[PDB]
Design a protein around this ligand. Sequence first.
Ligand SMILES: CCCC[C@H](CC(O)(O)[C@H](CCCC)NC(=O)[C@@H](NC(=O)[C@@H](NC(C)=O)[C@@H](C)O)[C@@H](C)CC)C(=O)N[C@@H](CCC(N)=O)C(=O)N[C@@H](CCCNC(=N)N)C(N)=O
Lengths: 99, 99
Amino acid sequence: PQITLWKRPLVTIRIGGQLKEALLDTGADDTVIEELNLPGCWKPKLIGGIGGFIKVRQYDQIPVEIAGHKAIGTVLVGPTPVNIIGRNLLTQIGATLNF
Amino acid sequence: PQITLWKRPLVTIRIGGQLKEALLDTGADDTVIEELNLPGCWKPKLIGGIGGFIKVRQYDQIPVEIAGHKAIGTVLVGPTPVNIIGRNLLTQIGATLNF
Ligand SMILES: CCCC[C@H](CC(O)(O)[C@H](CCCC)NC(=O)[C@@H](NC(=O)[C@@H](NC(C)=O)[C@@H](C)O)[C@@H](C)CC)C(=O)N[C@@H](CCC(N)=O)C(=O)N[C@@H](CCCNC(=N)N)C(N)=O
């Protein structure tokens, strides 16, 4: 599929059993999901951008399906206004920018 | 071009006669550039990111050449960690996401 950028590129994802909306973000190195009480071991991390840094929980080897395309990798969980799909998973689904 | 996402999608831009490097950022509504002088009048604004809010200067109707493609639109100037080309200009150059 092709997604234009007139509006925020929000798509449906599946993670930890749940369907969520998330932003496809070519400016994000990593994937950041809103507070979600996932089981499993995790480790502490800090991530930054506009406004500074936040504390997140890093979970590895989490299946994330993005618009029906399966991916699996690292997911950072913390307090975000929007779920963000970053390059670590965008590459797995073969996403490119085109102009 | 077609740009893959194994590395950050950084490109050269020209703005106010100067060359700069910037990140193609589908997660950004707006284009935000590090502190600099631009010609003309600006208005104060606040924007948010992953870590919270910052103050920026809003300049309207600024010509920006992005990897050789022309855009004319709003540029926010302030303490962003990375120069970012957001959807307001990405749409002008015809950029889409594809997978
Ligand atoms: C939580 C908000 C959605 C996330 C994006 C993130 C991002 O613009 O892609 C930035 C771009 C690079 C840093 C500036 N990426 C990031 O913040 C990511 N950072 C990174 O990838 C790296 N960090 C650094 C510092 O480079 C890495 C080393 O960790 C983090 C998500 C962590 C993985 C973001 O901050 N968007 C802002 C950009 C500023 C702007 N004005 O466009 C935005 O759209 N803000 C809107 C809010 C959106 C509401 N709009 C809406 N349509 N619903 C606004 N007006 O303030």
